[PDB]
């Protein structure tokens, strides 16, 4: 499935989550194949250039939806600013719904273009991995698993721990709760129903974003504990070729799922607060309308 995110005002983007994980997974296989033997550590910059060329091409196909994405941004600007144009919420909700439908439609159209780029990364990554060999097949070195972890994964585990993700969720629940509490009070006094309808809508969007952040936070917490336990087992020892390779695929799988949930949680956090900024404005404007009224 595809997620549509809003980092800052006027900045909509999209992620095809399975593609993100697929592409990341095959980046881990690639580095693990070249780090297994010391005679291939120099090839790191070639793997880098290849992976960046694949994402450049992936992003170029995303750029085909630029005009439909920009359409949705403008419609979202009308939705997020009912105080500037001031009538018929249903028409505005239907407008957003179809412009959003049109974006997913554009995305689905380029499915084969996206799959060819993904499948090129898979073929590239499996090519290096299928030629990974040991001096003694009964005793394959785990220094590549170690180096890759220290230089590619340990930086993200420390970074994610320094952030208190569980307090980010506490903060968001206070926001959601005080917003409903005020919302329910203002609804009993009326004013511009357009403002209450857009507050109700943005608020529900925020609960849905919160659920996704909460879900991705659980995964980040579980995967950071799983990568740290599992890394200990796959390091400081040797393995038979078969077991070393099954363990390279298992680590790559854990890393890609963690990196995915970290990427999405961060983006959904930017989206929650970007939407919250607009809820605040509409609350400010409804209170102005209500107070400067007749009795």
């Amino acid at each position: 499935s595809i997620d549509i995110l809003q980092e800052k005002e006027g900045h909509l983007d999209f992620v095809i989550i399975p593609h993100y994980t697929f592409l990341d997974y095959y980046k881990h296989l690639s580095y693990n194949s070249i780090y297994h033997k010391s005679s291939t550590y120099g090839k790191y910059i070639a793997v880098d250039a290849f992976i960046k060329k694949i994402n450049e091409a992936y992003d170029k196909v995303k750029s085909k939806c630029n005009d439909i994405k920009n359409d949705l941004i403008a419609t979202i600007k009308k939705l997020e600013h009912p105080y500037d144009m001031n009538r018929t919420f249903k028409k505005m909700m239907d407008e957003y719904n179809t412009k959003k439908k049109k974006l997913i439609k554009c995305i689905k159209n380029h499915e084969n273009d996206f799959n060819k780029i993904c499948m090129d990364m898979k073929n590239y990554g499996t090519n290096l991995f299928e030629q990974l060999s040991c001096y003694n097949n009964n005793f394959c070195n785990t220094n590549g698993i170690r180096y890759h972890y220290d230089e590619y994964i340990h930086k993200l585990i420390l970074s994610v721990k320094s952030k208190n993700l569980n307090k980010d969720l506490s903060d968001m629940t206070n926001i959601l709760q005080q917003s409903e509490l005020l919302l329910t009070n203002l609804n009993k006094k009326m004013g511009s129903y357009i403002y209450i309808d857009t507050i109700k809508f943005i608020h529900k969007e925020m609960k849905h974003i919160f659920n996704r952040i909460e879900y991705h936070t659980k995964i980040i917490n579980d995967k950071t504990k799983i990568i740290q336990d599992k890394i200990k087992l796959n390091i400081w020892r040797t393995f038979q070729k078969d077991e070393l390779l099954k363990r390279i695929l298992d680590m790559s799988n854990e890393y890609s799922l963690f990196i995915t949930s970290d990427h999405l949680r961060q983006m959904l956090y930017n989206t929650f607060y970007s939407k919250e900024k607009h809820l605040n404005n509409i609350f400010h404007h409804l209170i102005y309308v209500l107070q400067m009224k007749f009795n």
Partner: antibody
């Protein structure tokens, strides 16, 4: 969840007072702090608020010019300076935490009050 | 913007007490209420006209419409003797306005 203010002050007219208010049981920069004064036997007078995150303030009309609100986030403490005290400034000064979590509340209201700091003014 | 409150209200231990808070179009403002016992800091007892913060008993309730907000205290205990203040936020003046207060006297 508490607000602990500094002790009773006894000052001469023309002098200044910096009263403190330390926050505990929560993240100090996530909630606005208000100051309200009370003359003996009288009502509550809103003096203004401070955003503990930015240091931005909003002074009520009657308290503009001679009240300064600042904070020290390192020690979860907000301060209010009364400049050039006069006889009529004898009052209990209170610090009070706004119930809205975060910046730019659309509406203002208090939920946690400090114990008060009596400021006595005499020559 | 002014909030006008009757200076005094007196009730019997079992009876219910109503404290009014007058204001033009107060029905469009959200009213918060504070109880301040003698020589004590105020305590929030009603917020957003009728909601009770955690730890506030069901005896305390509120309503607001037209030009009058009401704080209703059912089954008034002697410990309910306090000054009660209503409060609003007026965006036109960017001011938090408190009412003049109502002293609750309990008879018996």
């Amino acid at each position: 969840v508490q607000l602990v203010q500094s002790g009773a002050e006894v000052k001469k007219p023309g002098a200044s007072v910096k009263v403190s208010c330390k926050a505990s049981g929560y993240t100090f920069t996530d909630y606005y702090i208000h100051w309200v004064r009370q003359a003996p036997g009288q009502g509550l007078e809103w003096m203004g608020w401070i955003n503990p995150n930015s240091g931005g303030t909003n002074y009520a009309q009657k308290f503009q010019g001679w009240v300064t609100m600042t904070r020290d986030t390192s020690i979860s403490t907000t301060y209010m300076e009364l400049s050039r005290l006069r006889s009529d400034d004898m009052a209990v000064y209170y610090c009070a935490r706004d119930l809205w979590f975060g910046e730019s509340p659309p509406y203002y209201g208090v939920d946690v009050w400090g114990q008060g700091t009596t400021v006595t003014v005499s020559s | 913007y002014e909030l006008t409150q009757p200076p005094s209200v007196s009730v019997a231990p079992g009876k219910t007490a109503k404290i009014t808070c007058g204001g033009n179009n107060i029905g469009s403002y959200s009213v918060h209420w504070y109880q301040q016992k003698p020589g004590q800091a105020p305590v929030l007892v009603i917020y957003y006209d009728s909601d009770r913060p955690s730890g506030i008993p069901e005896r305390f309730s509120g309503s607001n419409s037209g030009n009058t907000a009401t704080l209703t205290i059912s089954r008034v205990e002697v410990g309910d003797e306090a000054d009660y203040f209503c409060q609003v936020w007026d965006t036109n003046t960017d001011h938090v306005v408190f009412g003049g207060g109502t002293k609750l006297t309990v008879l018996g």
